Amino acid sequence: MFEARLVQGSILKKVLEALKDLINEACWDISSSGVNLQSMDSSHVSLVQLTLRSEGFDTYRCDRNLAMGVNLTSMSKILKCAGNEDIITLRAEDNADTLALVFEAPNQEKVSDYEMKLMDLDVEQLGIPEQEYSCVVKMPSGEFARICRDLSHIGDAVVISCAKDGVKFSASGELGNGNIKLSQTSNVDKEEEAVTIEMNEPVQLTFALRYLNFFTKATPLSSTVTLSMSADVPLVVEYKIADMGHLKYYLAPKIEDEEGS
Amino acid sequence: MFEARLVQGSILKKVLEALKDLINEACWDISSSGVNLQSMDSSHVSLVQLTLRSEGFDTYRCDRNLAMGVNLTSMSKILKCAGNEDIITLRAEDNADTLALVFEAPNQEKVSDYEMKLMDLDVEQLGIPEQEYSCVVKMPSGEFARICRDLSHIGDAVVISCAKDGVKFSASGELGNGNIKLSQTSNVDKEEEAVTIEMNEPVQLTFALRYLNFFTKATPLSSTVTLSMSADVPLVVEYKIADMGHLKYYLAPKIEDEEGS
Amino acid sequence: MFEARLVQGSILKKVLEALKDLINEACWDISSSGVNLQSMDSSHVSLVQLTLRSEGFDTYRCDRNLAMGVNLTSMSKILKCAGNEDIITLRAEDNADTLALVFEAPNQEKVSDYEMKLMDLDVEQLGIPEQEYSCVVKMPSGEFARICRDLSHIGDAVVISCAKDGVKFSASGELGNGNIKLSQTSNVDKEEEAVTIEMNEPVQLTFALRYLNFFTKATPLSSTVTLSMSADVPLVVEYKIADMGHLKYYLAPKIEDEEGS
Amino acid sequence: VSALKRLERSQWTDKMDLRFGFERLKEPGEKTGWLINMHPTEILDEDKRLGSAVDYYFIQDDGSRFKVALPYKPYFYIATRKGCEREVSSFLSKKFQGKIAKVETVPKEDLDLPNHLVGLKRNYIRLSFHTVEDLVKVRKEISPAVKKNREQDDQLDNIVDMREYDVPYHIRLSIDLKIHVAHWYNVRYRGNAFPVEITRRDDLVERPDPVVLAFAIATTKLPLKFPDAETDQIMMISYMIDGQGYLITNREIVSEDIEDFEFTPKPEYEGPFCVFNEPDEAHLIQRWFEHVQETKPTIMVTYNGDFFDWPFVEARAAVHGLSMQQEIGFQKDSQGEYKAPQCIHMDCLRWVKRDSYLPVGSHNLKAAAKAKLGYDPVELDPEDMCRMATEQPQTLATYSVSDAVATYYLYMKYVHPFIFALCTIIPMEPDEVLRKGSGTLCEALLMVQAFHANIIFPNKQEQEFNKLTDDGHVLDSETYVGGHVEALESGVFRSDIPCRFRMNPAAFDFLLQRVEKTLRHALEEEEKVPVEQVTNFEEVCDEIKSKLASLKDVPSRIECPLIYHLDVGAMYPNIILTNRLQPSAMVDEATCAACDFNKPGANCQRKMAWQWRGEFMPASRSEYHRIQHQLESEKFPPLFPEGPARAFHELSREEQAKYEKRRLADYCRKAYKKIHITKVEERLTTICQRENSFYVDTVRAFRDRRYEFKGLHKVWKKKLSAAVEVGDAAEVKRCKNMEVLYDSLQLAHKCILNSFYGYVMRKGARWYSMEMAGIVCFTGANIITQARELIEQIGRPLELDTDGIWCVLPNSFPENFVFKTTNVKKPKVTISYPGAMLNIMVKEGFTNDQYQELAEPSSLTYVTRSENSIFFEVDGPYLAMILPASKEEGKKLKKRYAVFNEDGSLAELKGFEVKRRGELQLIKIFQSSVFEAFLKGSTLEEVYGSVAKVADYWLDVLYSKAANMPDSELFELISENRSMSRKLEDYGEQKSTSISTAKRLAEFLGDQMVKDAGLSCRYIISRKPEGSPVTERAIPLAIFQAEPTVRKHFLRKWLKSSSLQDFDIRAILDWDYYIERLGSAIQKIITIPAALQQVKNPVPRVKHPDWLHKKLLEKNDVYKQKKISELFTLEGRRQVTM
DNA sequence: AAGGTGATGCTTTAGATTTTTT
DNA sequence: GTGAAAAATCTAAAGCATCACCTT
Ligand code: SF4
Secondary structure (H helix, E strand, O other), X not given: OEEEEEOOOHHHHHHHHHHXXXXXXXXXXXXXXXXXXXXXXXXXXXXXXXXXXXXXXOEEEOOOOXXXXXXXXXXXXXHOOOOOOOEEEEEEOOOOOEEEEEEEOOOOOOEEEEEEEOOOOOOOEOOOOOOOOOEEEEEEHHHHHHHHHHHOOOOOEEEEEEEXXXXXXXXXXXXXXXXXEEOOOOOOOOOOOOOEEEOOOOEEEEEEHHHHHHHHHHXXXXXXXXXXXXXXXXXXXXEEEOOOEEEEEEEOOOOEOOXXX | OEEEEEOOOHHHHHHHHOOOOOOOOEEEEEOOOEEEEEEEOOOOOEEEEEEEEOOOOOEEEEOOOEEEEEOHHXXXXXXXXXXXXXXXXXXXXXXXXXXXXXXXXXXXXEEEEEEEEOOOOOOOOOOOOOOOOOEEEEEOHHHHHHHHHHHOOOOOEEEEEEOXXXXXXXXXXXXXXXXXXXXXXXXXXXXXXXXXXEEOOOEEEEEEHHHXXXXXXXOOOOOOEEEEEEOOEEEEEEEEEOOOEEEEEEEOOOOOOOOOO | OEEEEEOOOHHHHHHHHOOOOXXXXXXXXXXXXXXXXXXXXXXOOEXXXXXXXXXXXXXXXXXXXXXXXXXXXXXXXXXXXXXXXXXXXXXXXXXXXXXXXXXXXXXXXXXXXXXXXXXXXXXXXXXXXXXXXOEEEEEEHHHHHHHHHHHOOOOOEEEXXXXXXXXXXXXXXXXXXEEEEEXXXXXOOOOOOOOEEXXXXXXXXXXXXXXXXXXXXXXXXXXXXXXXXXOOOOEEEEOOOOOOOOEEEEEOOOOXXXXXX | OOHHHHHHHHHHHHHHHHHOOOEEOOOOXXXXXXXXXXXXXXXXXXXXXXXXXXXXXXXXXXXXXXXXXXXOOOEEEEEEOOOOOHHHHHHHOOOOOOOEEEEEEEEEEOOOOOOOOOOOOEEEEEEEEOOHHHHHHHHHXXXXXXXXXXXXXXXXXXXXXXXXXXXXXXXXXXXXXXXOOOOEEEEEEOOOOOOOEEEEEOOOOOOOOOOEEEEEEEEOOOOOOOOOOOOOOEEEEEEEEOOEEEEEOOHHHOOOOOOOEEOOOEOOEOOXXXXXXXXXXXXXXXXXXXXXXXXXXXXXXXXXXXXXXXXXXXXXXXXXXXXXXXXXXXXXXXXXOEOOOOOEEEEHHHHHHHOOOOOHHHOOHHHHHHHHOOOOOOOOOOOOHHHHHHHOOHHHHHHHHHHHHHHHHHHHHHHHHHHHHHOOOOOOOHHHHOOOOHHHHHHHHHHHHHHHOOEOOOOOOOOOOOOOOOOOOOEEEEEEOOOOEEEOOOXXXXXXXXXXXXXXXXXXXXXXXXXXXXXXXXXXXXXXXXXHHEOOHHHHHHHHHHHHHHHHOOOXXXXXXXXXXXEOOOHHHHHHHHOOOOOOOEEOHHHHXXXXXXXXXXXXXXXXXXEEEEEEOOOOHHHHHHHHHHOOOOOEOOOOOOOOOEOHHHOOHHHHHHHHHHHHHHHOOOOOOOOOEEEEEEEEEEEOOOOOOOOHHHHHHHHHHHHHHHHHHHHHHHHHHHHHHHOOHHHHHHHHHHHHHHHHHHHHHHHHHHOHHHHHOOOOOOOOOHHHHHHHHHHHHHHHHHHHHHHHHHOEEXXXXXXXXXXXXXXXXXXXXXXXXXXXOOOEEEEEHHHHHXXXXXXXXXXXXXXXXXXXXXOOEEEEEOOOOOOOEOOOOOOEEEEOOOOOOOOOOOOOEEEEOOOOOEEEEEOOOOOOOOOOOHHHHHHHHHHHOOOOOOOHHHHHHHHHHHHOHHHHHHHOOOOOOXXXXXXXXXXXXXXXXXXXXXHOOOOOHHHHHHHHHHOOOOHHHOOOOOOEEOOEEEOOOOOOOOOOOEEOOHHHHOOHHHHHHHHHHHHOOOOOOOOXXXXXXXXXXXXXXXXXXXXXXXXXXXXXXXXXXXXOOOOOOHHHHHHHHHXXXXXXXXXOOOOOOOOEOOOOOO
């Protein structure tokens, strides 16, 4: 039996309300190391990956690797019922067709044990190996949220550039264009609000801006995010969740093809 | 005639905010004891009893009993003009179809007046029997409102079971199902968030959630809600409007007769 | 070229919120004395005047008289995704067909740029003569906004009736008519709450009530409002700013011709 | 009705028929007759007993006419339990003493009876009375008392079903003794002591020329208000006897005298009129009445005169010391019509309403005249016609005689032969086939054919209430899913344009092994010509192989297509013929098990599927039991005004059903957000193939009768061309009479045939079987989706419209081939190949091998045979195909397109807004212009450019606000012309723009403006009162013709602008809404289909919906969409457990 | 003094109805 | 004149973003 109990439960609420928007269907996977999600979106354009490590949990007890394709907008709607400081316990049996969620209220008086059924589906399984990422920056979450709400009123294609002067977020659109330039931090005493850069070569890439709005629903999850990019590789958006684990939003660029040249 | 003044405007207007949508026809009956409303919507399953006592009003004077056949949706569009502390004043004549509203500012500077018209009607007034209640609960309005708008997204029919240990709210549907358990609190100091349940025998019934959504629009009116139920008796939702009044929702349960067995 | 550095952003931003519904597209006027706008309504009824003086801002730098036909809704979208404490630099060119906006933050590490195209627009300019107006009345922004937005529930047009004893905001319609009365205050210290009535002669006027609802969108921008009128002239509504700008609304009255006699 | 009143009516009608020259035969003798009229009339017999009869009205060749009163006792049938037949008669023969003519037993077969072919007949009890009034008395006595007993399920309680009770009595005489209208009869009157004898003479068929009186009027009217029936006077009246015309005017309202004049639109119709002028109305009405007396007509002709002309003339005559009753014989009846006691009333609008196959856009005089007759009558506006006549009334005379000549010749060429050919088989008098709908006349025809088979007739079914399908879920509507209508693509498909064709080589390999079979079947079943007389079989059967191999090796090409309408002339008759499906035979398993014919391995079952659709309440059984038990003892307002309070348990079913629907329309409106849930499921029907063949054979008999009559029509048309080349008058006249008789007979037969489907599902139809329409339309969808998938394999489908596919095929496809045959009957035979392969694929999957027939009834000999008349006729290569596309996400327009014939003429518009009702005149001349201008061009972009060079004209007009275009034709350019359906108080709380403008006219003119039904509401939307919905901006066009200060006052009180100073039409009309309407039209028709075919936007003046433009720019973007799976390596595949 | 949280207006879209073509 | 489908409105409800309040 798979039982995972975690004390402060706004994190599991927000991480999956950020999962509802991007994809319609996901592949829950359980093992000894932790919970894995390696399901792509319905458009076969962008990917979400979750590794929620077991050592962060208050209580973790798992039998073996098991994959079940639970829908996400339903889990997000039922999970919205939980409070912002609840204690969350996922429970699944060995071979049952229903999983349960236990929410324990901060008042130590209210208990809320829900359950939902399962459904079958057919989704590609994909595995990402390790490639050097030429440019990696550390972005505050709210700053990135204002970025994604700021560029998306212009158009739908985003330029994510990384040069010696810093990082650039651009977008063209029917009403013109927008260019947002950010530089690294030097003399700030705090880390959760600062921005840090590291590079190997200048990177000039473009990505789908709508899927960044779909991504950035996990802004209040944690105040930091890793933006990683290199030549001809999918864009990496690493939202770390406390000491729990991390999520990678994989945004496949729409690479320019040599047609007119 | 009829001239009435009430210093606490909110306790009136929020009351009528509870009645903007559920019922659209009003038949006021006024006497020396106060003002009374007994309405029942075209759905023929919902009843509203609204009593405001004469002593609760700041200044009260009336000549004779009157029948006021005026639609109730209209003045909910009209009593939101007044502010929170803004003093409410009612003016009515012996046999005039015109009601005058005056909003006397607490700084005695800003006053107003609006006039309203009544229609003709023929509405049967149904008696309200005084029967013992099997299960009653005095429980905060905010928590009940949260329960209602949280279970309104999962399913549409609700199973409410008021047992000795507390109460269970179960919502089932295509999205899944979920039940929420509340118990009585004993070590509570303040009474604006305390809960208390009295028991004679356990009552389990199946209700409707959209009627409950229409009921709990007046959650800022009062901090305590009295829910009473028995065997095949309509739900009584009692709001203690300040100290003067009580608003009583009578909801006939959707009793499912045995047809499948 | 044209440079306009403005520290407090709200005194621009909220202004757009007060225009995007009233005028869909207008011609702007700039000068070394600040920015002057004479915008004409879409349905050809009302006029709007904005005078934001130069030293009310932080910095201007202008060469000559320039007129920019910036459409209101798209630049409203651009400012919709900015910050309140954000400092804004407007940049304009003499011959190029673009306008630049620079957002910068007090934390110095949040800077962004935007470019918006422009289109040529022909708007006639009217010169309203300066007349000594009989009725000048001062009310706070909040009560005037609420009385307009809650008396519009009554009818479709208003009649204002000023005498020595106060002003009468009456309005008639299908559900009835409502009149609003104002008294005088002498024991007030702070000037926003102070209501005063200035008399030259009692005045009768009638005005478009929907335009009063559309007028009360700049109420977060100001704290007090002055309504002024005289014999058979359009209403002038002034939301005076703290020596940063100035606002005028011209609502042409719908005078009652003697058609029944 | 008192019997004294009936006797007075009978003697008055006898005298009135005497003065109209239909003298009754009282002496013995022979006579020849040609029936033209049947009426029910009380005739006193020799026993001095009250008794009904039918008056037949015969005319002869020389003009002599007479009447015959045939008495036949009214009767019907009652059903009793087995072993309780004689006892019911015994009870009944001692409880209506002096009332029953007689009672007997007539055994007949049933249609829903189990084990029906063992040899049993459920014998009924036949009850016959004397008069129709007593018939109504006894039916009102007996029918509800046992009808409720049958619905909920003393010797009287053992009767179970009153059968055949809604039939008219005279129609039962027309069925029984076989006297139809418009046949020749030999009648022997042998005296009073015996009933008159009538026999059918079929040797003579030549149609005599009757006496017909057409009439039309003009009426004086005060401006802006239609003429009334208590102050106005008939402006003049024109009328027609057998082509000859007389007009009667009135001097006090005409300006000079007018003489005799003629008016002929074409040599086919001659219009000689003689004009009479009289000082006042008295001489007018008396002269018209006495001319009717002296001419003695037999059939009247009006044109929308049943609701306008007759009531106004009657109301005007009854006040001026006269009476329409005592002078001409015209008055109201129970159904709100004008039925003469001695004459047949023909309303020529009903034929356009029912039989003309026209939309409701062509019922007025001008469009219905130009749609069938072929000429355009003179247009006159009713408002200014009085003032125009005051200056000179000759154009008024022209308009009135144009009305008269149009209605008369519209009758005598089209309505007269078609109606007089309908009634040769339908047992209705002419005033019944014209008035009743297509359902009732087919009901009477099957009434005849099923009386010929000696089977009792089903009752008109009771309407079902509180429908229960699976679990509660009370259905608002229960329907069968009809024909799958889909437009698969959109845009242009022109004959000489190149189109990219993908082709599956597997399908071509499939046709490699079947060309021999297809061209064997093309002659063994479609021409009935065996191959042993043709010798060119090897030439075609290697030419097709060579062409199909040349197509095979390149299954991806770019060349011109061929457009084919691969359909069936009448698929719904053809399937019901082929499968032997009967509305009296579709049964479940229990009744088949009750039959003793359930042998192992039987073939009398046939299985079929169909799709069932339901729109039902979200409530359950409990949530409906609660509202029906709650509504028990509460008061309700009575239907009669000023009535007492009345409760639920004595309500009629209609009003209580309406109240339950209203209650459940708001109980679940606030509990489930929706009122009905659309549910589509599958159902399976089992059909017996041995039930009475009174329907499938009837359809077949009419099909082969249509074929035979078409052959005779063809040979008589060739004879008519030879005859008009000859020039001998008598033989030309006889040949033309036979030609129009045969043409009308075949047109009547096909009009019956097309409406056999439409009768079965009708409310109040005797053979109500939902399963018939369901399975027949499901089969008609399955065959056409098989055709569409085969075409999607070997070409491109374009449209499916539940009658056939429209198709573009490669130009090198085998299209048609000839055959030299040594047979004398068919020396040469040509046939199209796509039709042939469709025939062979539908006789590889739709062969009814269980198609059962009778051989010997005595020995029960049943023969199974195979025949499929389902044929895909091809309409040859058309020139152009037009499809529009929708603004809405994904979906596109259905059941609407525009196809052209070969020579560039318009072949067929269908479903478009050009000829709708309720549409503006700006969006109709636009469509008519752009379609005729569309076909120009060379390549795909040239066509869109050429049609944009004409569709941008109607944007240049609206942007310029019609400056140079005169305002005289502006007024009708915008005006709305929708029509009402009910009265304003019938609508109740419902609100819309037409209701709003009718209420604006209610407070602008009198209440009598909106009391009459079918009001032509006219309204436009103004500009100044913005913010509100467009309901409150619906100002009438009626105000613009009124007095100016009235316009000013009503404009001030309506659009609410007291400061307005200009009142021009050019500025009061907001052009943005009209530009939006024409833009939605142009992006329905042109712009979106052009974008869907990878073509640059033809007209830049209108913008696409947001889903179109974004995708367009993306496809024309430098970066190209790159996915993740093709971008980056994979891992594998997996599944998820329970 | 700022982010959570609830109220509430804004916005879009399914849908209920009528007329009409098929 | 079946049924399927279209055009054109209100219309009522779900979801959302933005602003007022309140506590940490
Ligand atoms: S199909 Fe056969 S078993 Fe069924 S009703 Fe007909 S004869 Fe009887």
